[model samples]
Target chain A: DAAVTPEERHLSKMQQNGYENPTYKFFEQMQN
Target chain B: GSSGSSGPTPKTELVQKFRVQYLGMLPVDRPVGMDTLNSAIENLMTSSSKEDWPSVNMNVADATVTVISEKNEEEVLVECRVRFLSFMGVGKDVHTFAFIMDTGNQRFECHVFWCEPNAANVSEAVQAACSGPSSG
Candidate 1:
């Protein structure tokens, strides 16, 4: 239960940031 | 160079989310997950091993996905800033990839550009490159 790498942590942080920020999702919707 | 008031604050292109939508150059109509996308990305970074390009072993930590430029409704231009760390201690080699997404196709396909540039630099470089850039 102790095998988290820095890469995972970094990705998690960025994705979390994306989820909280609506703008990111907004652009995604623009794809359509 | 355009310094001083000649230019206003150069908008910082905030990295977006890395989703299946941003995985460039995938076969159309294929089901892909995070694991598959990661593999593809890794292969791209190391593709230099086969070509005349520098073989920079890299691990993608995070990504900022954004659809900026577009050829049209079906073919949209996507930019992904992948935060990477090279095995050779090249520090952060975060890269900005310009890709094309086949949006009309039920099974979307993503394709990337020929050259890769440091993410930090290309992020802003595309600011003006893609007009009507969305920063959220």
Candidate 2:
């Protein structure tokens, strides 16, 4: 079994809320 | 002044507290390697005013990190709490450390500077906390 890294766990948590965060929104907007 | 009954005293926890300066947030397109994070911090530190940056108390304990704005010894601006599991990693440099919190979909990076005389101690505590209970 592979252990999960902190980064992976962190991303998983953020994904729970549909990736909702100010910076994420900005990133999405900029990408569009 | 006379000795009389006083207000109730509050209970305390085993929380480690640090007085850090909020250097603002950054939008990341991907996981920030040390080099990028270091440079980002450098830029922000040079561009911002040390006196203007908000002073915040970062309390770490019970597998959580809570940030509270400290305007004076009397008032707070805001409070943000994030679990230890949600932290990507704590990257340290000079007097600064970058707090990278991410969602697989997107990532958010926050930079904080240890302005206290015991800054190194504070940094080590934070890093140790993030390292979690595993050593491999």
Candidate 3:
């Protein structure tokens, strides 16, 4: 059986949500 | 004292490994505080002094993957075996961390240290990275 990577999993979730980089960008925006 | 956690556990409990390195010489060791990147960030948008929670920034570089545990209630442990970097707003430091993600409970924990670990600990981490079939 095949396995999934964390990056792949994270991207998969992002794709499911809409885009690929937004989640990270969104997370980054939390910075002050 | 620091409080709250950042990242949440994923549905799948797969162990991830990576290698990390610091930008400068290692620090002289000091007490560490606890907090979360996401949880703390969530508060930043509303809080007055972000310093109270300290806005943290984390970017994943390269990490190896491995699957451990046959049961679903176990924790997905992740260790970065690659050279990594860290900053405290003022300057960068050389160090690494070992994090654990509990899928069953959606809990996350990170253990960061300033000094390099012994060879045994690293060997164990490396063995873990190659033990399971974790790939996309």
Q: Which numbered prediction scores highest in TM-score against the true structure? A: 2
Which runs of model 2 end up more than 4 angstroms from their true locations? Answer: A1-32, B1-12, B72-93, B132-136
B134, model 1: CA deviation in Å? 6.1
Per-residue C-alpha lDDT of model 1 across residues A1-32, encoded as one tens digit per residue = 88776543433422222112212232233432
Better of 1 and 2 by lDDT: 2
Writing each residue's lDDT as its tens digit, candidate 3 over A1-32 gives 78866533432332222111111122233433
Please state the error at residue B104 of candidate 1 in Å. 2.4
Pick out the ten consecutive residues of candidate 3 chain B with the lowest summed lDDT.
Answer: B84-93
Give the lowest summed-lDDT range of ten residues in model 2 chain A.
A15-24
Docking level for model 2: incorrect
lDDT of 2 at B74: 34
Candidate 1 global CA lDDT score: 0.31
Per-residue C-alpha lDDT of model 3 across residues B1-136, encoded as one tens digit per residue = 8788678643433333223321211222211112332222223324433233221122222333222222332433233222211111111111222222222222333232221332123323432233313444
TM-score of 1: 0.30
Please write out the lDDT profile of model 1 over residues B42-113, one tens digit for every residue.
555455332433222111222333443332323334433321100010112334232223343344443422
lDDT, residue B4, candidate 3: 86
Worst 10 residues of 1 chain B by lDDT: B83-92
Cα RMSD (angstroms) for every candidate in the order listed: 14.0, 12.3, 16.5
